[model samples]
Target: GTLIRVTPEQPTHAVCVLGTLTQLDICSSASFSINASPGVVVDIAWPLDPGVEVTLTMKAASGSTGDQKVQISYYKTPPVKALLYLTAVEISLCADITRTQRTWTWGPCGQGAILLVNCDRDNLESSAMDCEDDEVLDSEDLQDMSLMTLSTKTPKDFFTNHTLVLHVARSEMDKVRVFQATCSVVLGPKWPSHYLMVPGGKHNMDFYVEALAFPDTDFPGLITLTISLLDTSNLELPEAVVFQDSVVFRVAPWIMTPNTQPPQEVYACSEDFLKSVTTLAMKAKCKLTICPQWMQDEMEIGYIQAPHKTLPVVFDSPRNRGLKEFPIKRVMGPDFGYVTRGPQTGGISGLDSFGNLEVSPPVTVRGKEYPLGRILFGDSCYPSNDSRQMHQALQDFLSAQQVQAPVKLYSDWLSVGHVDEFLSFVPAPDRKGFRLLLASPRSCYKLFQEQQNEGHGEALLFQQKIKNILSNKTLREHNSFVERCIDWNRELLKRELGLAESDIIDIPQLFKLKEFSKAEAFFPNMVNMLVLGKHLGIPKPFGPVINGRCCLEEKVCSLLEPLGLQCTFINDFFTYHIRHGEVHAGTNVRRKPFSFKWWNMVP
Candidate 1:
């Protein structure tokens, strides 16, 4: 509710707009065009630009009463921009940028005019993709922020002048860091070589392996060091990326405290990793040996790798695929289509390595401890983010199972920041994984177009490669084509880690709601076979049947039960019904179904 005065209330008013131009004017009006008597006008004396403006005025108030003038006024100010100082671009580019193209006519800062600046974004380039010659970055090309200065004045471009600021576009962060790391590793020593040198990102000092090796006269067992780059991206998992030539590293001997015992060739890194991850499916939960306390206390790193705590190689080893159980399960309906399972009700009974009936928490790990949270490498089946229903569904499932080990919970790493963290962990996640590849319909169509275009000799080469790969398979396999022109979209990280590139399994294509059955497919041995379904009896329909007394109302001879009313079937499934003996269908109509046929039919 709002209150209204019979007459307008007079009051002093003021307004302000941050960052405005210098000169401005102001005046007050009672109505849109009606000015108060003795109207006051204000004009500030200062240089102004064609940008934002702010005006203020003070006037003595006037009333119809004589000698009753009081003070009242209004203030209004407009917006403007701050002054330009310095700008730089951290990205690697193919060509040098010019000042004129980088500069724009910026608006004033405030009531007093101030310069506005915008770095020329068009000239910016990504370090990873840029092919610009390294030598081109000197005098003739790039320049400082000073409008009149040339590129030639530099003790060192980035270091000499502190005024430069780099504009970081969101897109180019990852690749720049990776390629930078790639360049760095190349500079390291030959095996058994040893050295420790101060690190630097300068172009001249960029590759430091030689200097690092010179300092070590003694034979070092093995130089092992991990580089942690500053830049991070959370595409799917957290990953760290360095600049064009930036790389983080560590080199140590074999005897180092957390020594690398020669890794047994249990399985290739990628294969072992995949085996470890299969348990992350949705319809099922992982049957893991909970890590133990002694192990947690022994491992100097953290609870994640506790000592003396291990599941039998059959269950925990990345290479151990001969286990009796499938670690993961997907939800599907009776016909093998995707569907939600109702709920979990029973606990599994099993024996431990020590021979004991696995009771309440059936699974447990040895030598473990619990922490508030821990980070994890997540998967498709066990999504990091979940809704309330999803959470409840998991709770129901876990309630039926017991774990001897700790159930670690992590929430942050599952978010956007994960991209950077994923990259930092050395030896990335196992490459072998069940993956889902999704693409836009338009992109799919264009890809098919490219595969169809085979010009002259190129056609024969493509055919030969296809035939060789599909030699044992039928035409159905050979006919599958590869798209020639596809979008290189790194931003949409859908590729899951698989054992091998060829091992990448195609998942059923899911487009919100459209029939693209041909697009649906799966990888070998990728189905979860389980059903937790039940049935309920339909006994509530007769409305209790009212014992033997109510049964007498129905006649058995001339007519059994009479139709009390009729109902209309809308669509094929739904029926609209009306009750009997009412103007319109009353909701309270009742009818008894015919019940006299059983005895006569039997005779």
Candidate 2:
């Protein structure tokens, strides 16, 4: 019997409840006065047993006394075997107050289900995104897919008349795939309105929903999965509108760790002069994981996590440089996941390298807070016509990881075309807990002019080409455009990262364009430093010696020391600088995750 609720509307009404369960205190009656403008409500619970009937009679008093009688009846129409649920764990309706299987949130106390991207390729014998594979390949296939269960008692004749349909939105078709785990052979459906049942043999029905893609600019992060019980008694009305049970899932986002997070392990390409990175590993007390084989570009560490599991996913650069084989051959193993995208529309440019990617610690923009800081990468200042942005596939993948929203900064003008060449972040004691370091030629000129004013123009520096370009024609003109691009990002970063002018620290640096088209560090790029906890691996900018001190290094120490950071300047001219990269691009760190669950709001 359906629940019956009665309320006095016009001039108050009297309600009497009588039911099969009346032997218990579950049924009640009430009467209301004419002055009861808010009205009185009476609730009646009726037993759902077959052939059960409950009746309610209502009579109004005082004004226009109306009378009515209502009957509630129940019949044994369908089998009592109805249950559907999904969980992050293999065996767990997690019927909590928040209804864990029904709703997921960022609250460390949240109750929701999370979906992991079937990102890692499964078979040691084959290749392809496991979700993209038509058939399950290995243990990996089962491990990555979340579990769902449907239970029923008997395969009665009623099952054929009323169909159970598992449904998803047509818009969601490309993002998730569902499989029916019956007996041994698992079958997946191609259409949304699916037919489901209790097979003749047993009582259990298990299913799995596989994630097909990540969230991007085009896709929102949330997904809804539902089970509908359709009444197909007659062919006339196109199957009566059905009963429904729904569960929501927000596909886990791949998060980037910041300098503020403690490192669990540090990875550096195996090469000569790794002493600086080793020292950083030792200082941070993180294990030094080395790439025993050669990997061309080795500086990305991204991971996706849930309450049940965590996987470190490395992004393969689309350029297919010497590092093309690294993500699969070196990084991916039993649990470490890997994801990559081809330069779909066209061949890419320098900015396509994963080395350009960076993410900040969490920040608050005005009234809004980014629990996961937004992602930053290099792109052309101009929006179209073969500009040097990362390819659409790569950009879409990063955008799809909705937690850390992505923002593009101007960087294609650089010789390396990577964001690391011009900026970085480090831990701070106050004012949002981290400060961004930016390469400022303005600061560099100030230092140079100050020293020259004190009669040290004889020391080695670039006043010669400074005039060669500044007084010359096109070189200075191109650099002015570069200057405007950097300034545009300066304002953009302040807005995007919720930062102020003083929140940023400037490293003294200058740049000269290669053939008047791209900019390279005239000296070692100090902003391209690698950060490990409170320790920074800054490139040694061989600066003018003044009275027993290199003002560049002295100035950098003065700025960072107050923040409690220890700076270690290393010579990278041969190993990285001359090769168009630096310490941050030469190394990667896998950091400790949040103590509060990511799925939860301490989230």
Candidate 3:
């Protein structure tokens, strides 16, 4: 405790107001001189604990100086012993995130609180978000909500004299909900901002915060929960905050999977690749969900995860080609959640497909390890800067998932404009536990030139096609431009994903000038393959045969087989290939979750 000066100014020491706690520490009658030698100074000792207010008048020399009334109060710490914490990351333990909960992080060493969207259907009878039931129905549902314990140590009866209000700001009212095993919820549509927090056993109050929605264009995934102790002694006026504390939680991000993780479920609209994926699913152990032809094109699977609850969320593409009912009728139910973005205002194009969105296996970028890997999407960034972006709504959602930082690359050159068309990731026994495979047009041209010198016989079709490959100047010119586009992403990936030239394998693949300048796979695209652990479901590339072996398959085999990857090439020519999409684009995979708990991350 220290002194707080109170005095008699020029006007008059007419009124002095002090709380009971301050009366013992209040002091006055110290005489001094103001102009000459006729002044008295009053000082009150600073309260040892918090929430003590004092008011007094400081008199000047005479009426000309007047008197100044001062009121001073203290919060728990001023800096705040909010001692605010949560049962984040590791459930059951309310780790006090006093220092770092404000910012968000991912990985085991990082610190940040996580929030579930309460998407799980808690009541089998009701088909809305879990919290819609208002009261927590089961123990599992309580686990989904972050347990927040508000405990404070103050002067005895301090809490009894003051009113505690647990609340959120008006801006945050819609983004979250709270459950007091003590305070009852009110209003079905919009709940009250501040709730009366009665003292439960002198400073031990346990409340739960429920996340109502995922981060969107406006919601940044971060929300603040505030608790204020109001000064309600003055009956004539409204109460004011004397002590306050706040804690922030980031809405659990929608996470993606990488090739190294095993598949849990697979989705596809067409049957051509169903047998292939189904057969692979058997060995891989997955639930195969088939969709009808009416609901096609959209093919990406991601999920919402928290320490206690996990839901597979299907991401619908912006092509909006399907009945749109595919996302609604089939996917959104019980534990399964779904999301879709509207078509781009400029008219949706190939760059907007899920094939353009992919994630790398846990990678290290610039010495920073991304245990959950990074999200890679495509955009138009080559030859000429086509002012193109993924559907803005989709981009917002991707960025909204604070984890898996996104990296956008130049994929608009491909007629399909998906990242899967030119690049892929495969688990490698050597070299950082993974490998990057890129379709190298230069490698394809080199292979074509070699086949021209000494080629095979029976495959005259591919041989004749290779003749146009070596002869067509316009196509060659177009490829040069396409190859340049590939290089831009290649170098960018090298810098962003921290790749070495040796870690990248150039798949010998060719492209043709489709729609004049846009490029499409000349044969089936080889790099676009469905990766399930070590087993690879690749699109069989029908290139010219050399020594009774399709040079394209041989090249891919030699490249990945040495890394212990099983290469199983399948025929998708009439199926996905005809539509300008390949196996990876045509199929959706739900993979195993991250090994490290997101709650464990220290921000």
Candidate 4:
């Protein structure tokens, strides 16, 4: 049985009752009336099972002598409280990727840069959604839904077992709306990477982290999300805590989306699309009914008579109702199935009734009515692209964590022009594909350099360990296959360097690309190879080698070591399933690759 609602439309209409569970009560009754109005005229008996769904139907037989019609609905059992789980662990890295340079003469004291990584995987691939450019608004994927009166508390099961949904204020233009960024993570590090960074205009990505285990309790931990920045030495950089996370709780996996599962009247379009449909068009005039007076009218008794003018009315939520639908709309659009009355201009504004701002249908910049669109929300408001201070505060929070002495980034050595385009204009849509999202210049440079330093150091250490082992000096050989590969590469590196021109193999050039540079050009190529390799389920170039041969079961990754490759930390974990199709999405993205060649860029 469908829900039947009896609205007090006339004096003879059924008397109104205000309370929770009232809608359910009236809809369930067989035949009820309001002041003689047929409030409920039906004979749909409810089987009345716990958790059973019921529908309410109301029909208008004939208007009374006073032209008043009756309405009603079948009673429905209230929804049972559902399970909640920690869906996502959002870590708001404090800063967008850009140079924060500090010069160093030698050892421990200069400015070092740190890159923030957002855990909410929303617009990770589009223009402006660059993984490196952290400061771009509309990229922050967590939103405060409580302010919208959607739920009293953040639901526990949001995005659990579902694709990851990211909320961003820094990812898009500055205004008052929340945008969605979606993502999916497959099981195991061996899985290939597959992500979609859709077009600029609008999007709503529901995160899906499919649950595992027959009983589904394998991944259990306090749902605390944390972010830490590690320096070139893998030392903690003080400002890693710039990331913010919701309060920790035990979480489980589940599926979720922007709208209800069965689908309802609420629209699921992105804000960009909504904005497009709402903008005023040529020669079109209209009004947007924001909040209503009677809705806002603070009378002790919450009842107000309808005015002569039929202004569009929307229900302004007063309590927390998770995912509650907004009031009925009168305006029209292509997506919305219902036809709307002619556009009008008048809306309740501030305190005074006359002072109400006239809200014509969504007007273009020129005041002409555009196709109607909607800005989805419950009752609160938020800025769209204006949270720089908030982000900086988070950065500063992480900077506080720097207790151990760490190598400083040479901030003075960097400039916005020098940074990758993705780092600068993150969240800018390519209007092409998702690959454009990862073109993070700063992130690539930072990670590549770190890997190079670590790999080189490990190679040197491995040789020393091997020397001791051969000497039978008591230390057992450390048996990580990855370490052995590093060892082999180091030994072979001596021979490789012997073949290069003197200047082409300079060691100092590894750190400085401009003057005294040696390996500038090779850096980006290695990074690209590593990224591709990681996506193809192949051994990362430097991971390991057995029997004097690079790890290759088949043709895949045969050329990896010869080319010298290094991939992002996340990509490194994706060695097994990273085949062509696995990482094809990221390949299409155009970003400045890692640069070891430009270390000696001509001044």
Scored by TM-score, the top model is 3
Per-residue lDDT for 1-603 in model 2, tens only? 223333222121221221111111112322111111212222333453323333322222112112222221212353221111100001111112242335556565566677778777667756566666556667556767767676433223435555667778887767787776652223333565577754422255677767776666677677777766555766777765434566777777777777678877776676445887788789988888776422324336678775556777777777775556667776775567777676634497777776678888888888777766778988987876646777787788777776677899888778778888888889999988899898887777777767777877667642342223234456446546666767888999998988999889988877778854778887788998878888888888877777887778888999999999999888777877787777777777778765544555432
Give one digit per residue, the lDDT tens place, for model 1 in 1-603. Answer: 111111123432211111221122222121011122232332323222224233323232211112111132322454322211111122221111111121211112111111111111112342211111222122211221111111111123322212221212222211111112113222121222112121222221122121121001231111222221222223465433222211111111000000011111111111222232222211123132321111110111111100111111111111112221111111111111111112223221110110100111011113221111112121222343431112233223222211111121111211111111111111112332112121222331232233333322122221233223223243223123211111121121222111223322221110111132111111110011000010100001111012232111111101111211111111100111111011011000001111111111110
Give the Cα error of residue 462 in candidate 2, in Å.
Answer: 11
| Weakest lDDT window of 10 consecutive positions for candidate 3 | 82-91
Please state the error at residue 573 of candidate 2 in Å. Answer: 0.8
Order of candidate numbers by lDDT, starting with the best: 3, 2, 4, 1
Candidate 2 — which residues are off by over 4 angstroms?
A: 1-112, 121-129, 132-143, 151-174, 177-206, 217-223, 230-242, 270-272, 292-299, 344-346, 384-386, 453-455, 461-484, 547-549, 594-603
Question: In candidate 3, what are the lDDT values of residues 257-338, reduced to their tens digit?
Answer: 8877777876677555678877877777777888763222465667777665677766777776653456655665666655
TM-score of 2: 0.73
C-alpha lDDT values of all predictions: 0.18, 0.64, 0.65, 0.20
Ranking by TM-score: 3, 2, 4, 1
lDDT at 423, model 1: 16
lDDT of 1: 0.18
Q: Provide the clash count, candidate 3.
A: 16
- On lDDT, the stronger of 1 and 4 is 4
Better of 1 and 4 by TM-score: 4
- Of the candidates shown, which would achieve the greatest lDDT relative to the real structure? 3
